[model samples]
Target chain A: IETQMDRVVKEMRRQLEMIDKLTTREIEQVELLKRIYDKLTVR
Target chain B: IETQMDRVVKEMRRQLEMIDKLTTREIEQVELLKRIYDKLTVRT
Candidate 1:
């Protein structure tokens, strides 16, 4: 029982790591896209 | 004008913190669902 719970938590933590990594990259991508759009539409 | 703009910046930061907290909890919930699904489907 304890071991199974531990396994679940470990997997969740690993998933969290990947989620954060992807999220950071996604945030950067959005920033870049917005920068390009602003540049294109600037006066 | 500076004070008003500063307030808006603070509000944005507060909203960002709330958004970050909610998004993290969503990931936690997703992992839990995925774990249950794997247990139900995986044959070991």
Candidate 2:
């Protein structure tokens, strides 16, 4: 049966997943930033 | 009263605020990226 603690656990898990997705996005943006910086400086 | 439900609600609110901050940061990064794109294309 579902319990209150179960609901909280699910919510916490969902937040963790969102954080994981954002972390991946942050890494991708950093890579893009690096490429842009390189192009900006190469000239 | 300080109950378990109260703690959970607080945690959820904190998570939401974190999401909001990240959203703003994403917008800022996009703006910076657009400026870089403009500089790159203007030179071509």
Candidate 3:
């Protein structure tokens, strides 16, 4: 039971890490797009 | 023990769903930005 619990915990932790990485990437992409918009619109 | 496992599974599933929702939103935002860029650049 203990070993099974450990496996479950590890899997959740791995998924959480993956989610965080993806979130960081998404935010960076949005920021980059915003930068392009700023560059294009500024006089 | 069984109940605990169920809780763990539920939490993970919830998190996964949240991630998917965020990913969709991100893609839509990028597409919207791209559309704006296209609109700005076209000479028509």
Candidate 4:
């Protein structure tokens, strides 16, 4: 379990770093995906 | 142990349904990000 957690944490950190490197327009795409998904189920 | 695993499965199903609603264009982004990260490190 400990080893599994370590890799999962690393994966998410990689995701965060990718986010950090994104330009403003690229970040907007993430939000747009989130919001677009939100519209389907958000109540 | 069974109780904990049950809850985990349930949570994942809930998330999967949420994923099921995504547009094809939306799902496209995940792979694009994946390839980019693939080049950066030795992932196994």
Q: Rate the local accuracy (lDDT) of all candidates.
A: 0.56, 0.77, 0.76, 0.52
Q: Candidate 2: where is the Cα deviation over 4 Å? A: none
Residue-wise C-alpha lDDT for candidate 3, range B9-42, written one tens digit per residue: 8878879786887878688777968776686877
Which pairs, if any, clash in model 4? none
Report the poorest 10 consecutive residues by lDDT, candidate 4 chain A: A16-25
Please provide, for model 2 over A1-43, each residue's C-alpha lDDT reduced to its tens digit, 9 standing for 90 to 100: 2476677778788878878877887887788788777886888
lDDT of 1 by residue, B1-44 (tens): 35544444555565566568657756654565565455546534
TM-score, ranked from best to worst: 2, 3, 1, 4
CA shift at A31, candidate 1, in angstroms?
A: 1.0
The 10-residue segment of model 2 chain A with minimum total lDDT is A1-10
Error of 2 at B4 (Å): 3.6
Candidate 3 CAPRI grade: acceptable
Candidate 2 CAPRI-style tier: acceptable
DockQ of each: 0.02, 0.25, 0.30, 0.05
- Please report how far candidate 4 places residue B25 from its true position, in Å: 7.5
> How many times do residue backbones clash in model 2?
0
Better of 1 and 4 by lDDT: 1
Of 1 and 2, the candidate ranking higher by DockQ: 2
- Candidate 2 clashes between residue pairs 3 or more apart in a chain or in different chains: none
Give the alpha carbon lDDT tens digit for every residue of B1-44 in model 4: 45544445555565455445444435565755565455445433
Error of 2 at A42 (Å): 1.4
